[PDB]
């Protein structure tokens, strides 16, 4: 094209300002560009992936460098408690003198920010001890970023441009990624733990200098090649072991003993080494499954063809599904995002209950920030998975090649799926809201004993099945005579039971009726968001109101006011509506997590157990009570270090409320206002000299929906982050 954007001829000749907008949100959607082919699209995807890797490495290098240059890692290593981590220094010319006073924390000589990302504990656990290690790591990550950028440039040149069939070689890619990207990387991390991190935890400094001279075991690799692997699990670290020193240390490398370290309240490093070694073995085995140039292996196409149930209860089964899943990039993107979101929720739910880094369980603000961050990330990623599934249905789905498949039969019975999801969401919402309102009314009338409190008997039984003994159930892993208890009695059961039955950590917290109600509200949110996203995906190709939606693309505003009105009829609008429900669900999850943990850390779990059963308790004892120090960050009497969190709190409230006008007020009013504004500028003396090149127009309907959603999400995230960090930092527990 002759004008920005150059990838779209239709947008380039636009005389209005929306072109400037629309060249931004369509820049990375290569499939909608002008004069594109398949191989060019694949090569652009490859180059953008290399770029993204480069920015990830550069961001990590910047984190390491700023911690090394402005942080207090060396003084934090000596005293992991009673020392606050420092992320980076603060240089603000707008700062007043009391701002410089209140923000001078740690051993720093100026204003600093207190790191709540947990990178200090992670780097301390894995062997980094001094600032020169952080400088070397930052240099290595910068070199990796440069290498990835060079590779992205190289693989776009005509000599090194890959063919489209190379990208479609799914068997070799999956084999290499399972064996090399998963197995070999986990084996290398096992080697790092065994050679460096585990000796570092015992007071031995192992670097590239003494790399080849320090034996990880007294017996070397002999117990690895001649059998008798148990010689690597002879004497583990004692219960009186102190992290980072040789007092109470052992010489074991790979052990299977459950529970946490007594001092750090985190998992044993030898446990992690054995875990990553076993995972490396499993992935290296699994990476020899599919066929390659060597004749042996599986063909996933025939794997999908063969799995047809006789009787036709699944139609033609998975016939032809390999071609659709291999040819469609949006199918792969949706599956990748769904799996990534599921394991991100797994990461969030497993780091708080089974902490992985030394002295991170005591850092409550770090744990809260990490959990909230990864849960919001997982929610956004799952929403994107469903959105890209809808995109695949609109763009890449081929009905002729998918007849009587397990994929077409979803569209065959989409009404049943949508209606049953609607029933589940309606039932959950009706009964959960009714129970909550019942409890609020009963306690308002001075009768808290008339509440409906349902004990989560199922989840309590599951906790007893995992070894908890606070409910009286004599079941597996809690009864001393069970075969499950007897089989694993000698290996890991004592430590695991000691960690579970300890009522100070987050491992299998005691739950009550409030947990039941909030978990059912969580189920309501999940079911409703799934309902919206599944309805959008399955009605993306068309419905009775708009049978030809597939001809109108993924994102279009409406179909006019005819047929009763057709606002928000596209699948993009279904995604936009479901983002609100995802935000509400993650808000409920993080509210529950933060309140339960902030009552446990104070040793006042009775407040949560008695106040979480009604919504006024949530409003008063959680939102109103814990925001005193947050809103008192600055007052007429002065300010303190929580003033930044108060300012970000109000900033989030403001930008959350600003999206309400991109969401409520619509386009015609603003266009008719802009017409009068243009008339005023064209008729104002000394101002007709200055004229616009692009004609001012109102924001597009889809554009305004996106802008309002962005303001809404920014307000949600910033407000809750400010409240969470201020509440957990004004009192640490």
């Amino acid at each position: 094209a002759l004008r920005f954007p150059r990838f779209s001829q239709g947008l380039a000749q636009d005389p209005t300002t929306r072109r400037i907008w629309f060249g931004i949100a369509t820049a990375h959607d290569f499939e909608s560009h002008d004069d594109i082919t398949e191989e060019r699209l694949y090569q652009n995807i490859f180059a953008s992936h290399f770029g993204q890797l480069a920015i990830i490495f550069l961001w990590t290098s910047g984190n390491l460098f700023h911690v090394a240059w402005q942080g207090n890692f060396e003084s934090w290593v000596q005293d992991p408690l009673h020392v606050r981590p420092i992320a980076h220094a603060i240089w603000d010319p707008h700062f007043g003198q009391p701002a410089v006073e209140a923000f001078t924390r740690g051993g720093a000589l100026g204003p600093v920010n207190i790191a709540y990302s947990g990178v200090y504990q992670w780097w301390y656990t894995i062997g980094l001890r001094t600032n020169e290690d952080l400088y070397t790591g930052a240099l290595f990550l910068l070199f990796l970023s440069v290498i990835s950028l060079l590779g992205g440039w190289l693989h776009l040149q005509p000599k090194w441009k890959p063919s489209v069939s190379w990208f479609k070689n799914a068997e070799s890619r999956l084999n290499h990624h399972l064996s090399g990207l998963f197995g070999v990387s986990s084996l290398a991390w096992t080697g790092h733990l065994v050679h460096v991190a585990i000796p570092g935890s015992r007071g031995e400094y192992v670097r590239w200098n003494n790399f080849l001279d320090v034996l990880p075991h007294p017996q070397g690799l002999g117990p690895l090649f001649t059998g008798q692997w148990n010689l690597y699990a002879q004497n583990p670290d004692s219960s009186s072991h102190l992290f980072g020193t040789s007092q109470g240390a052992g010489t074991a490398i790979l052990t299977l003993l459950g529970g946490f370290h007594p001092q750090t309240q985190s998992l044993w490093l030898t446990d992690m080494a054995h875990h990553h070694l076993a995972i490396a073995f499993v992935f290296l085995v699994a990476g020899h499954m599919y066929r390659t140039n060597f004749g042996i292996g599986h063909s996933m196409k025939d794997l999908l063809e063969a799995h047809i149930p006789p009787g036709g209860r699944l139609g033609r089964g998975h016939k032809g599904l390999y071609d659709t899943i291999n040819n469609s990039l949006h199918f792969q993107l949706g599956l990748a995002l769904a799996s990534l979101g599921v394991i991100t929720s797994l990461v969030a739910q497993h780091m708080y209950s089974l902490p992985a880094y030394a002295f991170i369980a005591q850092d409550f603000t770090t744990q809260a920030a990490l959990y909230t961050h990864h849960q919001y990330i997982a929610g956004f990623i799952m929403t994107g998975a469903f959105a890209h599934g809808a995109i695949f249905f609109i763009r890449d789905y081929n009905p002729e090649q998918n007849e009587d498949n397990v994929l077409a039969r979803m569209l065959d019975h989409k009404e049943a799926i949508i209606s049953h999801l609607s029933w589940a969401s309606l039932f959950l919402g009706f009964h959960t809201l009714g129970l909550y309102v019942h409890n609020d009314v009963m306690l308002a009338f001075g009768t808290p004993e008339k509440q409906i409190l349902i004990e989560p008997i199922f989840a309590q039984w599951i906790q007893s099945a995992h070894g908890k003994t606070s409910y009286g159930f004599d079941v597996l892993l809690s009864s001393t005579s069970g075969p499950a208890f007897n089989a694993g009695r000698s290996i890991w059961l004592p430590g695991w039971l000691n960690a579970v039955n300890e009522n100070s950590n987050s491992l299998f917290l005691t739950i009550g009726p409030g947990d039941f109600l909030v978990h059912h509200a969580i189920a309501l949110g999940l079911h409703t968001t799934t309902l919206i996203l599944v309805k959008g995906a399955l009605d993306a190709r068309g419905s009775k109101l708009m049978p030809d939606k597939k001809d109108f693309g993924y994102s279009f505003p409406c179909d006019g006011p005819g047929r009763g009105g057709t606002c928000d009829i596209s699948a993009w609008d279904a995604f936009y509506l479901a983002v609100f429900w995802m935000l509400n669900t993650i808000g409920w999850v993080t509210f529950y997590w933060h309140w339960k943990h902030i009552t446990l850390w104070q040793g006042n779990v009775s407040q949560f157990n008695e106040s979480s059963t009604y919504l006024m308790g949530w409003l008063r004892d959680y939102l109103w009570l814990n925001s005193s120090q947050l809103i008192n960050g600055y007052n007429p009497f002065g300010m303190n270090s929580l003033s930044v969190w108060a300012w970000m709190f109000l900033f989030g409230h403001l930008v959350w409320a600003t999206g309400f006008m991109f969401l409520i007020s619509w386009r015609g009013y603003w266009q008719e206002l802009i017409e009068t504004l243009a008339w005023a500028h064209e008729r104002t003396p000394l101002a007709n000299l200055i004229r616009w090149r692009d004609k001012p127009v109102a924001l597009s309907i889809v554009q305004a929906r996106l802008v309002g959603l962005a303001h809404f999400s920014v307000g949600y995230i910033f407000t809750y982050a400010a409240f969470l960090i201020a509440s957990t930092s004004g009192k640490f527990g």
Binding site: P636, L650, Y669
Partner: protein, 82 residues
Amino acid sequence: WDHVFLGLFWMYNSISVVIFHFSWKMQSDVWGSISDQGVVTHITGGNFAQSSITINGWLRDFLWAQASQVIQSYGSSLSAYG
């Protein structure tokens, strides 16, 4: 009609700000109690002059501070208000 629908929100906003101003100003500078000696003690102690100039002051000293009488009304005769 949509212009009326939009202006309803702005009338709501304007009247809400007006009534918040009235409530805080009369609670801080007019309403209160008279002692037998002759001194006057107001409900909010005359904090409108120094706190209402900031949005944080409205959030803390007006919304958060005075909502304690409506969130703690459970179990009493004012629980219908909660």
